Amino acid sequence: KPKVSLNPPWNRIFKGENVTLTCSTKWFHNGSLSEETNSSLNIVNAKFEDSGEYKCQHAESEPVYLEVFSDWLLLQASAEVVMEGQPLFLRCHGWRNWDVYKVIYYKDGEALKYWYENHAISITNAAAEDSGTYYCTGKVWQLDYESEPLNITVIKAP
Amino acid sequence: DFTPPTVKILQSSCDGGGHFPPTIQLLCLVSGYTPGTIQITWLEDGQVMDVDLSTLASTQSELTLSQKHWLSDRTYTCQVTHTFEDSTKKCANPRGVSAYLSRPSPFDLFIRKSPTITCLVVDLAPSKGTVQLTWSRASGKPVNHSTRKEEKQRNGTLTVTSTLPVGTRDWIEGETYQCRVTHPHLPRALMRSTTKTSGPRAAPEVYAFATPRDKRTLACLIQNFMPEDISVQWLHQLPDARHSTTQPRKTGFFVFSRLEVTRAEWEQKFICRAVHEAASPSQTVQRAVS
Amino acid sequence: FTPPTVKILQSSCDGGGHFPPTIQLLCLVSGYTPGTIQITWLEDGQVMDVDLSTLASTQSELTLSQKHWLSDRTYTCQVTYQGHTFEDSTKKCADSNPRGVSAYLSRPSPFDLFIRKSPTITCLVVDLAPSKGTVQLTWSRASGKPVNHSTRKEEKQRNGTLTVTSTLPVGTRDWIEGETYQCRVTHPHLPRALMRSTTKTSGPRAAPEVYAFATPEWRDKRTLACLIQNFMPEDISVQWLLPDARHSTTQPRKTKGFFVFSRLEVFICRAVHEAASPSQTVQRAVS
Ligand SMILES: *[C@@H]1O[C@H](CO)[C@@H](O[C@@H]2O[C@H](CO)[C@@H](O[C@@H]3O[C@H](CO)[C@@H](O)[C@H](O[C@H]4O[C@H](CO)[C@@H](O)[C@H](O)[C@@H]4O)[C@@H]3O)[C@H](O)[C@H]2NC(C)=O)[C@H](O)[C@H]1NC(C)=O
Ligand SMILES: *[C@@H]1O[C@H](CO)[C@@H](O)[C@H](O)[C@H]1NC(C)=O
Ligand SMILES: *[C@@H]1O[C@H](CO)[C@@H](O)[C@H](O)[C@H]1NC(C)=O
Ligand SMILES: *[C@@H]1O[C@H](CO)[C@@H](O)[C@H](O)[C@H]1NC(C)=O
Structure with a gap:
């Protein structure tokens, strides 16, 4: 069973945004077979219908999900579920080439970090205690925006 | 065979290090205009702040601003009056x-x-x-x-x-x-x-007051009402701009109304009407003062 | 030999705070004993222009590229009068x-x-x-x-x-x-x-007028008001003689060429204003 990779890693993108699924191959958008053979599936200028369950095969390999939003701030995330010690990237993303300022991340309610300009979270050693509901506050064109919340959960395993 | 005026605004300069003065002068240069009657209106973000009237000449009008006021990023206009104008921020x-x-x-x-x-x-x-x-x-x-x-x-x-x-x-x-x-x-x-508006209502109370120059001054204390949504006017129906009114402030709420009316209106007679949702009869409380 | 006062006025900005194609710098030298004044202009320490004229005043304007100005260079207006330097600078x-x-x-x-x-x-x-x-x-x-x-x-x-x-x-x-x-x-x-x-605060002052009012209420308590008006710096202080929270006070609002209301639910309405004479206080009372 093959797995499906996303570049960039973010399973949540904005409209018009691109993304590339990597995996003589068959693709399965929503369940329907896509007219793509290549091991890598291309997505130019995303539309909303580009949302939904994706999966590939050469033995059929399980599903990855892609949400498409239009908004001011999208809290992108590396993975929605991680296993301890694995990398986790968080990213408070702003509409297009737009600049998000005074960005603050919140984890479970508390102020995780604040910076003048935009910044991102990066943990090479995903701590099991990191599981929380995240969201990010930003400032676009002088105006205030709160990001949609995103649940994230690590898994410690013997 | 006249010639309109040329209107430009000069502003205070900065510290050698690029810092703002405590106060910030605005200098309005009305220049090169055919000798007549010129009146300069000063607009803070669309609102009058000051007015003068002076009578191929030139003339100057000056407005001073708090360094804070200035840093508020409000847009000041110089409006020479047909209308000419320059604006800065x-x-x-x-x-x-x-x-x-x-x-x-x-x-x-x-x-x-x-x-x-x-x-x-x-x-x-x-x-x-x-x-x-x-x-x-x-x-x-x-x-x-x-x-x-x-x-x-x-x-x-x-x-x-x-x-x-x-x-x-x-x-x-x-x-x-x-x-x-x-x-x-x-x-x-x-x-x-x-x-x-949700929440419980409560009708207003009203009080028309009068003060001791030789022009008029009249007040009104409409209080204890329970949606902020209220309406105040003075009749005689005197204009909605001949008086001023505070914002509601929880006390219920309350508002003050200030109506200045010439001693000439003192020679005809007034009324402070509160049009409130909870107000009993026709949805209106009211009073008067002599 | 009265010393001149030196200040620079500049070009204002677009209604949208945009920079002129070219920025005028105006050097106002004003209020000096009629003599021989000369204004040297100094771009970041180097002479750019000189002007000489002989209780008067004088001006000397220097102009700048929008880019030159945005170069964040420091311009100095250097008045030399009755053998003594005076100056003002700017850039x-x-970013504030x-x-x-x-x-x-x-x-x-x-x-x-x-x-x-x-x-x-x-x-x-x-x-x-x-x-x-x-x-x-x-x-x-x-x-x-x-x-x-x-x-x-x-x-x-x-x-x-x-x-x-x-x-x-x-x-x-x-x-x-x-x-x-x-x-x-x-x-x-x-x-x-x-x-x-x-x-x-600059500008002309004007002492307040005060008026203590009331209209007894329906455990029945009566309410007290105050109309402090016609003062000329917004800066005023209102209190009832009683705690600074037992009463409320509107913001100042310009009247017929300011004013404040004070609402005291519970005597004396004191207005502590800069222009107010004698102790810097007007005030009144109501029964
Ligand atoms: C595959 O399946 C997935 C679901 O598993 C499906 O994703 C869905 O896409 C639709 C759009 O086709 C989304 O519906 C949208 O919701 C947003 C919410 O903000 C609306 O703004 C969208 O309306 C816009 O688009 C209209 C027409 O394009 C415009 O006229 C209008 O102005 C709006 O801008 C739209 O209603 C829905 O949210 C998702 N569901 C999920 C789970 O993401 C996808 O469409 C399927 N793709 C294919 C190819 O089968
Ligand atoms: C998304 O894809 C299309 C085609 O490659 C391109 O027009 C656009 O520049 C891409 N956006 C990126 C990679 O920033
Ligand atoms: C952060 O909170 C403080 C305290 O309420 C406030 O002074 C400040 O304006 C806030 N900063 C932001 C996000 O602008
Ligand atoms: C421009 O002016 C109007 C009021 O005249 C105001 O509502 C608007 O916000 C202003 N824009 C600014 C100050 O950025």
Whole structure:
């Protein structure tokens, strides 16, 4: 069973945004077979219908999900579920080439970090205690925006 | 065979290190105009602040500002009056659309019985494109006819309006009115609602007062009412601008009204009317003073 | 030999704070004993122009490319009169909200100033990224008069930001006599130093008028009002003689060429205003 990779890693993108699924191959958008053979599936200028369950095969390999939003701030995330010690990237993303300022991340309610300009979270050693509901506050064109919340959960395993 | 005036504003300069003065002078240079009667109006962000009147000459008018006031990024205009004018602000950044949505006047609602809610959209890029504005009733029933008036503002922004007429009963029975702003710039659509205010009501109390120059001064203390939504006017029906009124402040709430009326109006006779939702009889309390 | 006063006025900005294609610098030399004055212009220390003219005044204008100006070069207007230099300088006003920080600087309460006679201005700085002993705050008087004794509060806010305070005590007389108080914020993050000033408000003053009113109410309690009007710096102080919270007071609003209401639910309505004569206080009463 093959797995499906996303570049960039973010399973949540904005409209018009691109993304590339990597995996003589068959693709399965929503369940329907896509007219793509290549091991890598291309997505130019995303539309909303580009949302939904994706999966590939050469033995059929399980599903990855892609949400498409239009908004001011999208809290992108590396993975929605991680296993301890694995990398986790968080990213408070702003509409297009737009600049998000005074960005603050919140984890479970508390102020995780604040910076003048935009910044991102990066943990090479995903701590099991990191599981929380995240969201990010930003400032676009002088105006205030709160990001949609995103649940994230690590898994410690013997 | 005259010649209009040339209007430019000079401002205080900065520290050698680029810091702002404590106070900031604005110097208005009205120059090269045919000797006549010239009157200079000073506009803070669309509002009068000062006025003078002087009578191929030139003339100067000066306005002074708190360093704070100045740093407020408000837009001051010099308006020489036919009209000529120059305007300046703290040298600057872009700012996205805001959208406000009014509730009807308790007066507009019961007295005039012709309620209107208004959707206001500001800080629009005039080049961003065109702004669609759209009304809708929570219920589903079709809206009436919305009057859309625009006014390209002095500070370079677009300010779109759309006043929608509303049914008293529809309103009174808890309808919800939606205003939906779309634009090529915006990643989504702005959306503002307004409905009859929840919470317990309480009718107002009123008090017309009178003071000891030789012009008039009259006050009014409308208090203890329980939706902030109130309307105040002075009759004799004297104009809605011949008096001033404070914002409501929880005490219930309260408002002051200041009506200056010439001792000549002292020679004819007045009335302080409070048009409030909870107010008993015709939805109006009121009093008077001699 | 009365000394000239030297100031530079510049081109204003677009209604949208945009820069002219070209920036005029105006050097106003004014109020000197008629003699031989000459104005040397100095771009960042090098002569750019010279002008010489022989209680008068004079002007000398220098113009600049929009780019030259934005080059953040420092221009000096150097008056040499009756054998003695006078000067003023300027450059493009540095960004006042660097990296988004904000710094506010209060004026004293007219009460704090005349009644309590213990004036304090306060310099506030918000939206700072949290740091430690990096943040320096520094007071200075325009005059060059000495300055000592100032608070410093580097306290940490709920939303992840640092909010630094420093309240400085100020002399009523010093203040009253047009002193100017500088607050100067430095930081490892900021490319320069933030700087806010504050001074006695300009313009012509005008003492208040007061009026204590009432209209007994329905355990029945009666309410008391006050109409303090026609004063000419917004800066006013209102109290009832009783706690500063047992009453409420509107914001000042310009009348027929200001005014405030005061609502006391419960005697004396005191107005502590700068222009007010004799003790700096008008007031009245109501039964
Ligand atoms: C595959 O299946 C997935 C679901 O598993 C499906 O994703 C869905 O896409 C639809 C759009 O087709 C999404 O519906 C949208 O919701 C957003 C919410 O903001 C609306 O804005 C969208 O309306 C816009 O588009 C209209 C027409 O394009 C415009 O006229 C209008 O102005 C709006 O801008 C739209 O209603 C829905 O949210 C998702 N669901 C999920 C789970 O993401 C996808 O469409 C399927 N793709 C294919 C190829 O089968
Ligand atoms: C998304 O894909 C299309 C085609 O490659 C391109 O027009 C656009 O620049 C891409 N966006 C990126 C990679 O920033
Ligand atoms: C421009 O002016 C109007 C008021 O005249 C205001 O509503 C709008 O916000 C202003 N834009 C600014 C100050 O950025
Ligand atoms: C952060 O919170 C403090 C305390 O309420 C406030 O002073 C400051 O304005 C806030 N900063 C932001 C996010 O602008």
